[PDB]
Amino acid sequence: MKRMLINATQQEELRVALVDGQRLYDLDIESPEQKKANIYKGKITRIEPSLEAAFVDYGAERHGFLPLKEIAREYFPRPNIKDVLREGQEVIVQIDKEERGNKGAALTTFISLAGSYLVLMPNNPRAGGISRRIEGDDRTELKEALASLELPEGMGLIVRTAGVGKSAEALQWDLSFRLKHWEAIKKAAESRPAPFLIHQESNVIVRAFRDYLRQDIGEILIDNPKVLELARQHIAALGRPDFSSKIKLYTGEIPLFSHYQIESQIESAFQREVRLPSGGSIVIDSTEALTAIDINSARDIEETAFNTNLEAADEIARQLRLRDLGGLIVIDFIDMTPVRHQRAVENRLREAVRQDRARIQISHISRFGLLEMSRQRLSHVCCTVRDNESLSLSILRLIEEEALKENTAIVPVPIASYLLNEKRSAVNAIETRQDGVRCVIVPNDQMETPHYHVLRVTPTLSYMLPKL
Ligand SMILES: [Zn+2]
């Protein structure tokens, strides 16, 4: 049984976890925003032939804006807007653009329902296709897998970027949840006067249900009565009443996430090292430019390397999700001598991320044994520390260099101790060789080993210099 677990006992972190048995395989976290793509029933306040556009009271203290290019044929009893829409005439409206400075919000009757994989436009069939970002090979199957969906005649569809690695049956499951929603949309509207909200475009539960409900999900356990009932409303309004029987209140004293043992794996998304089933590990270091992943073996050399890399490919994949790693990612797989092992390790990472929602690109193992890849984002320092002694002689040589300059040290405590005792001879030797030059070595308890300043040049006291 795969379950969605939702924890909201804590006001400042709403947590959503997809869990297969007890194995965490996805996580979404939302701490304490915009009003766009929201669907309402609005009343036509006033019309203007002057702007070929009308005004719609969808419920905001400001009235929205409905151009003639957005009035659907379904609403008509080139034209003037005076011929199409009457005042007080109800209409199903979606925000096309937010409120800007003054009370301006642009609307459309041409509604769109964006799911995980598909964007249904039940209102105009003149829309549809594969996302522009998809390309030659990645998109090819799609247009085919696209054609095989069962789309009602009067509407058109778009395949999203997340649709790159999904199957025909998985796309079908999306299109249905979209249609179910659209049926709830136009029904919560036929049953009421003007105007009032239907689809909250983006509250977190709407998203979790939008993005995460696959047929394989058995239960949705929510540990908050106040939230659970909002979710029922959210499931019903989200068109799919039936999952309503499968949302169940969590009542156990042991907090939801602790009872399913996931509180620790959630913490693993922070861990730098992650153990692979066969004993090996991946190390995930992040740098300025990119994220780098190294892979060590557990404890046939060719078989071990191969099996370890394959186990890594899987773990990397799920770690890419839990961590929500964005941008450039470089993987140092354990070296493999046969080309096909490389091909086989590659194809996996390909297969392992097929279910991730983000846009992912993966290149081949370079001759150095590196796999460059990238991942679309869905949503520091302390450096070895140089010896005191080694650091001291460094500074000492740096002071001397400053003492030589024509027209001519703030160090951590034990550096100053080392310099002004163990190296007093050399410090003296500088001042005597550089006649007239004062070498002020002030210890500073506000600093430490790593750090210092050698400043080149008042009747100020040595210990009052760090402040100056
Ligand atoms: Zn450090």
Author numbering: 1 to 32, 35 to 79, 87 to 308, 314 to 393, 402 to 404, 407, 412 to 436, 441 to 489, ...
Article, verbatim:
RNase E is an essential bacterial endoribonuclease involved in the turnover of messenger RNA and the maturation of structured RNA precursors in Escherichia coli. The N-terminal half forms the catalytic domain (residues 1–530), resembles its paralog RNase G, and is relatively conserved among prokaryotes (Marcaida et al., 2006). The RNase E catalytic domain forms a dimer of dimers, with a quaternary organization resembling two pairs of scissors arranged in tandem. Between these two domains is a pair of conserved CPxCxGxG motifs, one on each monomer, that coordinate a single zinc ion.
Quaternary flexibility is also suggested by a second RNase E structure that we have solved to 3.5 Å and that possesses small breakdown fragments of M1 RNA. In that structure, the quaternary organization resembles the previously described holoprotein, although possessing a slight ∼10° bend, and its tertiary organization is nearly identical to that of the apoprotein. The positions of the side chains of several residues in both structures are not certain because of the poor quality of the electron density maps. Quaternary structural adjustments may occur in the binding of intricately folded RNAs, such as M1 RNA. However, the complex between the N-terminal catalytic half of RNase E and M1 RNA has one tetramer per RNA component under saturating conditions, as shown by native gel electrophoresis mobility shift assays and by nondissociating mass spectrometry (P. Ilag et al., personal communication). A bent tetramer may explain this observed 1:1 ratio of stoichiometry of tetramer to RNA.
